[PDB]
Amino acid sequence: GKLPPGPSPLPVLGNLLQMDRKGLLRSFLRLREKYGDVFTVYLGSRPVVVLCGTDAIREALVDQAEAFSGRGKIAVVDPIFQGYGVIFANGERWRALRRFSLATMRDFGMGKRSVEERIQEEARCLVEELRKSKGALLDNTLLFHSITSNIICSIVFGKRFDYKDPVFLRLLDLFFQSFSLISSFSSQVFELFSGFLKHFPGTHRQIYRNLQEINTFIGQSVEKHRATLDPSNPRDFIDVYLLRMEKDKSDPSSEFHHQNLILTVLSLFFAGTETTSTTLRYGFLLMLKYPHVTERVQKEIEQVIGSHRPPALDDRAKMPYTDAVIHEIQRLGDLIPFGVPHTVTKDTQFRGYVIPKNTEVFPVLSSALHDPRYFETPNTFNPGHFLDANGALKRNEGFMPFSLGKRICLGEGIARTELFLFFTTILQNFSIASPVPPEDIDLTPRESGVGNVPPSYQIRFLARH
Numbered sequence: 001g002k003l004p005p006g007p008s009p010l011p012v013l014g015n016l017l018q019m020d021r022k023g024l025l026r027s028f029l030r031l032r033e034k035y036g037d038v039f040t041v042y043l044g045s046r047p048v049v050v051l052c053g054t055d056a057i058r059e060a061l062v063d064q065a066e067a068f069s070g071r072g073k074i075a076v077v078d079p080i081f082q083g084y085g086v087i088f089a090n091g092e093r094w095r096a097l098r099r100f101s102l103a104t105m106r107d108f109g110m111g112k113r114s115v116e117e118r119i120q121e122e123a124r125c126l127v128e129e130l131r132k133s134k135g136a137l138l139d140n141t142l143l144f145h146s147i148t149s150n151i152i153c154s155i156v157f158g159k160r161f162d163y164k165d166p167v168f169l170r171l172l173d174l175f176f177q178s179f180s181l182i183s184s185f186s187s188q189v190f191e192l193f194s195g196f197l198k199h200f201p202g203t204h205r206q207i208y209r210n211l212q213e214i215n216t217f218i219g220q221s222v223e224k225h226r227a228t229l230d231p232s233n234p235r236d237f238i239d240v241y242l243l244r245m246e247k248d249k250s251d252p253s254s255e256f257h258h259q260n261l262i263l264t265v266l267s268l269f270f271a272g273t274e275t276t277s278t279t280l281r282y283g284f285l286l287m288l289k290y291p292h293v294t295e296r297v298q299k300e301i302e303q304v305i306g307s308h309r310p311p312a313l314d315d316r317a318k319m320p321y322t323d324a325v326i327h328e329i330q331r332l333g334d335l336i337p338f339g340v341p342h343t344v345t346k347d348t349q350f351r352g353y354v355i356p357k358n359t360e361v362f363p364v365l366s367s368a369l370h371d372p373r374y375f376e377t378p379n380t381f382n383p384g385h386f387l388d389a390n391g392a393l394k395r396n397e398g399f400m401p402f403s404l405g406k407r408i409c410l411g412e413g414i415a416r417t418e419l420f421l422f423f424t425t426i427l428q429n430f431s432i433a434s435p436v437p438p439e440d441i442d443l444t445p446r447e448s449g450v451g452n453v454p455p456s457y458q459i460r461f462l463a464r465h
């Protein structure tokens with residue numbers, strides 16, 4: 001068969017030279033109009049299939065769920081192919097270890113009420129920090145990365161850190177050092193400091209010192225966990241990992257398992273922090289721009305929850321307006337616009353084309369979240385996109401911010417619970433304000449017109465009743 005159509009490739013560098021300063025997404029818009037909703041682009045010598053709009057993406061990821069279930073391969077864009085290989089973590093074992101972690105993640109005890117509990121507790125701690133600010137203008141970027149990372153910490157180590165715990169501050173600094181703590185100005189900051197960062201003396205020394213401290217912490221925590229381990233009551237991720245190790249007959253002193261544990265915990269930290277944090281940050285920017293929406297949410301909190309008690313996950317079912325607002329925030333927020341790449345597990349036939357085994361495939365989630373076939377005003381913030389005439393929450397096929405099919409976001413439940421409880425506990429306790437009138441606030445994704453980054457903004461949290 002033939003691959004889906006697309007712009008003609010240059011031998012060996014494919015379509016890398018033919019991209020626009022306009023931006024990747026707008027360019028994907030152009031190719032789709034020119035070639036349709038399934039097209040092929042060449043990253044160097046390697047073809048990549050691009051899936052646009054709700055229907056094509058669901059046809060692949062749901063209708064042919066297994067065929068499209070392959071995990072992405074980022075080796076693809078890796079320049080060093082004058083050797084090929086990949087230096088893929090010390091042999092067959094590390095393949096073993098990564099699936100050990102995946103299993104542990106997939107086999108790690110939901111304890112939904114215990115996760116809910118952890119998030120309520122974090123939400124309380126956040127409210128006390130916000131009250132202290134006494135309505136001062138602030139940048140909420142660091143706080144929102146703090147609360148989301150602290151949930152991961154509580155699920156991994158069994159308890160949250162204090163916000164100014166030295167080890168917690170090193171974790172947050174590592175986020176900064178790895179770019180998982182960026183703002184609107186960050187890129188001009190990096191640019192200003194480029195000679196420092198890239199020429200001399202770089203940041204590897206500072207990153208090293210952070211990782212050593214984090215590594216020490218984790219090792220000590222592992223020991224303290226092992227010393228009190230109870231198979232009938234796994235407390236957290238470390239316990240579940242230890243339990244699987246015990247079962248595997250694994251050396252308690254393995255360096256491989258120790259390394260593997262830390263890399264898995266870093267993965268969890270990174271996955272669990274940035275997208276959720278940025279969603280909250282964007283949500284409050286939208287709440288500033290639409291004060292009547294925010295008022296309606298506060299009205300619903302009052303009706304269903306009241307003051308007097310903290311929001312609980314069970315309240316969401318009774319708060320369709322608030323739930324719609326959060327859906328809409330995620331929709332317009334569009335945190336992972338190109339999706340996470342998949343590969344097909346075998347030769348795949350798709351709308352009459354053939355996609356060779358192990359070809360990279362991007363389900364462009366932005367093109368579903370903005371699909372006019374499913375949302376009447378894709379580029380306008382409107383909670384009504386998720387509400388019917390009776391005011392009840394409406395299911396929308398186009399709503400796939402966590403992807404779909406076999407490998408939907410493993411954190412989708414924790415993420416949605418954080419969004420619901422953080423948004424409602426904050427708004428129950430505070431009103432918000434900024435120095436910019438709503439009609440003047442600009443929500444366009446800053447950073448070169450593309451890519452990401454919500455505009456950085458100032459906000460006041462004004463304590464209620």
Ligand code: HEM
Pocket residue numbers: 105268269271272273275276279335336339340341401402403404407408409410411412414415
């Ligand atoms: C608003 C927040 C979040 C968004 C929009 C987001 C979205 C995504 C998306 C689009 C994927 C790719 C699924 C695919 O391969 O098709 C995914 C992967 C995943 N997410 Fe999230 N996510 C968020 C929150 C979280 C959180 C809180 C965690 C918690 C640790 C997390 C963990 C992961 C995991 C482990 C994967 C890999 C799943 C698989 O390959 O097996 N995510 N997520």
